[PDB]
Ligand binder design. Structure first.
Ligand code: CL
Lengths: 125, 125, 125
């Protein structure tokens, strides 16, 4: 059971209020990261590890890791960071088939920023 | 073989000289992280990956990752960071049954801070 | 299939223009990290996760994660960070037998810095 991705941006600060569209692709063999939207689509249910290191050239930075719960049919910020120019973070999240995870930043308009996730434990039922 | 946890705090700077008691729980299905103490208890021996991203609102910050060696019957700082407001780190540690791992900070009294660990390789004997 | 390492330095800023020779060893049971050179040697082909948290006491810092592609017979910077005193990063990289991965920093001459990697998915053919 394989499902992983690692993507980059190579810029200072992308556009806010939208999913960060990471263009640079370090790994994406299962094609579970959508480069056209910046969202990771879960196709294998289980526990996933997400890690990111984002640089931001904005004021009042607000970094959020979103999860769209497919079964609950609603989106929420599973993780949030505030007022940090160089925001780093990592978290474990359990995902179901259809769930979506992506990164988002908010700030006021006035370096490799990464976003990595992989399946650690797959569900066994 | 599953053993993982990912926990948060959602505050600026917790209390020093004691294990950081992470209240927010992102994942804890094996119930190996003690929310009442902030210590992870190893129940499966093997190689574990620990990662943390702590924000601190204190002076002369001192971030330490402690390991209580059950067999050696003594506690030591397996990792330490000094004079960093936004401390990030990750490390691989081999643990035995009964070992304990936790985070601790020291500073002078005057944002999601995470602490994640999971079993990478379990011992085979 | 096991192949992992986690190493430290315990200093402020090592020497530039050369692979960072991490002397402190948190884990190295497969002996795939060369302490005399600072390079990780891949002996099991597959997808590897690399994470690092380097502190630097230099000006115009330039942190790079190098990969020597054994089959292509050439070395390139798989990851790069610029003008960051406390540089953190993580990435997934696929490696073949003979590939080498190491960290490198550039700066102008005027705290635990870690470097961790482990085999996530091994190739199955
Ligand atoms: Cl990290």
């Amino acid at each position: 059971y394989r499902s992983a991705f690692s993507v980059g941006l190579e810029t200072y600060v992308t556009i806010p209020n939208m999913p960060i569209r990471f263009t640079k692709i370090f790994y994406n063999q299962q094609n579970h990261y959508d480069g056209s939207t910046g969202k990771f689509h879960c196709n294998i249910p289980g526990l996933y590890y997400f890690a990111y290191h984002i640089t931001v050239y904005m004021k009042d930075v607000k970094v959020s890791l979103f999860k769209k719960d497919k079964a609950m049919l609603f989106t929420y910020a599973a993780y949030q960071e505030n007022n940090v120019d160089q925001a780093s973070g990592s978290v474990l999240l359990h995902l179901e088939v259809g769930d979506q995870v992506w990164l988002q930043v908010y700030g006021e308009g006035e370096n490799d920023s990464t976003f990595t996730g992989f399946l650690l434990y797959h569900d066994t039922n």
